[PDB]
Design a protein around this ligand. Structure first.
Ligand SMILES: CC(C)(Oc1ccc(Br)cc1)C(=O)Nc1cccc(-c2csc(C(=N)N)c2)c1
Ligand SMILES: CC(C)(Oc1ccc(Br)cc1)C(=O)Nc1cccc(-c2csc(C(=N)N)c2)c1
Ligand SMILES: [Mg+2]
Ligand SMILES: [Mg+2]
Ligand SMILES: [Mg+2]
Ligand SMILES: [Mg+2]
Ligand SMILES: [Mg+2]
Ligand SMILES: [Mg+2]
Lengths: 5, 236, 236, 5
């Protein structure tokens, strides 16, 4: 999955 | 509220203890109680709230994905049948996840967003609103799916508009908002080109503003810039 | 029981799904429901029950240790005061841990142990009884602490007596029982010499019986033997 | 901590 914060 | 009898300061203290003990469900319950005292949240308190619920919902999302994968395979050609149990349990986890998202969205709507006037608070909360609608969209399949997606988009867009007017391009909240809105475009809105454009423009505008920063601010901004680059590498 | 309306087989299936999703609280609730159907548990089902509760209580124990450490430091010289919150939250986690242990002990007493006649089931359940009393002993401080310790000892001793009469020295249940009873001696009963003697004798008697085993049984037994050696290395 | 299973 892509990075989120 | 089961936290109504506990002092605000004690709830914040116990949220920090719960974090140290990796008890994120408790952390979130303490922070919900703190929000429900009705006072605005400081910067530290806003981040305690977000850390707690991000960890809770992140675990639910991971579990939902495992169960959805199992359910998908069960419904392929070759599998004969194993009953309603996989769907039922995926639905149970899904309903619990939706409940947590609804709880967070409820705190934002009653009344964190409407009292948030400074960019650092208002952008932070609107980003959260976009994030929790995005998590609802990840599991949505019904008559309301398009409206859930548009609710996420609208919250992210309001946050973006404020962030571009009121924050420097290296502000970590502005960067994290762009990171997540870019992921929304890629994974939710079927808009990979918008996701890539947003990540690239955000990264480049931040790069150009790093020269204004102290060493500590530089560290914070470059950390999020590296996440933007990581996603760009994944997508190109 | 909130699981009273769900089929036994569906509860077992969902316990396995919960494990895949790393949802150990759900796993334990499904297995509790399965036990409460009143039928004996198969070997696989006994291990699902133990895996679920071991993971739940293991997380509680880790959190309790973090909080107890913070509480200890707060009560040293130099610390001025930070209020009742650390003690209160440590107590909250402690009470929840005790509740889980009491639940497991209740399942063993109503009525898993009394219906368990084969060594593989009876030793397994008595080991669990010793383990959950040991977890109660880790947090005990009151009039009943010595009785809690003796309840753990008594359960482990009955399991040990059966295991030595009815199982080969390489049986993984017998090995795991000895491993944990040895830890009980070291950490709970202030008996490090008994802990070391038990671990060494168990290891050596298992070594001498490995020649009778298939490759797969050898793998299972040597895995637990290595844990015995790891503890001996820690303690000597 | 020591190993248990
Ligand atoms: C993940 C990381 C590195 O960056 C971002 C960046 C943008 C957004 Br939007 C969100 C996170 C972060 O957490 N930054 C951060 C920024 C300001 C305060 C705290 C904080 C105070 S207390 C506390 C706690 N965990 N007890 C954490 C943490
Ligand atoms: C930790 C390890 C390696 O060894 C021991 C040894 C002694 C004791 Br007493 C306890 C554990 C173990 O788990 N062994 C084992 C033995 C027999 C059955 C299963 C099982 C069936 S299903 C299932 C699941 N997790 N879905 C697990 C697992
Ligand atoms: Mg007050
Ligand atoms: Mg649903
Ligand atoms: Mg643009
Ligand atoms: Mg039936
Ligand atoms: Mg107590
Ligand atoms: Mg002896």
């Amino acid at each position: 999955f892509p990075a989120t914060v | 509220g089961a936290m109504g009898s506990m002092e605000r300061a004690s709830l914040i203290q116990k949220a920090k203890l719960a974090e140290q003990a990796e008890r994120y469900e408790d952390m979130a319950a303490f922070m919900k109680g703190a929000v429900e005292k009705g006072e605005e949240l400081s910067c530290e308190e806003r981040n305690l709230l977000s850390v707690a619920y991000k960890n809770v919902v992140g675990g639910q999302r991971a579990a939902w994905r495992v169960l959805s994968s199992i359910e998908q395979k069960s419904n392929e050609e070759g599998s004969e049948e194993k009953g309603p149990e996989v769907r039922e349990y995926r639905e149970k986890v899904e309903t619990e996840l939706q409940g947590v998202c609804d709880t967070v969205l409820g705190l934002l709507d009653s009344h964190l967003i409407k009292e948030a006037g400074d960019a650092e608070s208002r952008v932070f909360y609107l980003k959260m609103k976009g994030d929790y609608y995005r998590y609802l969209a990840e599991v949505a399949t019904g008559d309301d799916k398009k409206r859930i997606i548009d609710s996420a988009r609208s919250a992210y867009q309001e946050a973006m508009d404020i962030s571009k007017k009121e924050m420097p391009p290296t502000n970590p909240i502005r960067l994290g908002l762009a990171l997540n809105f870019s992921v929304f475009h890629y994974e939710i809105a079927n808009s990979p080109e918008e996701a890539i454009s947003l990540a690239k423009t955000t990264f480049d505008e931040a790069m150009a503003d790093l020269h204004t920063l102290s060493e500590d601010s530089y560290k914070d901004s470059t950390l999020i810039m590296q996440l933007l680059r990581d996603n760009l590498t994944l997508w190109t």
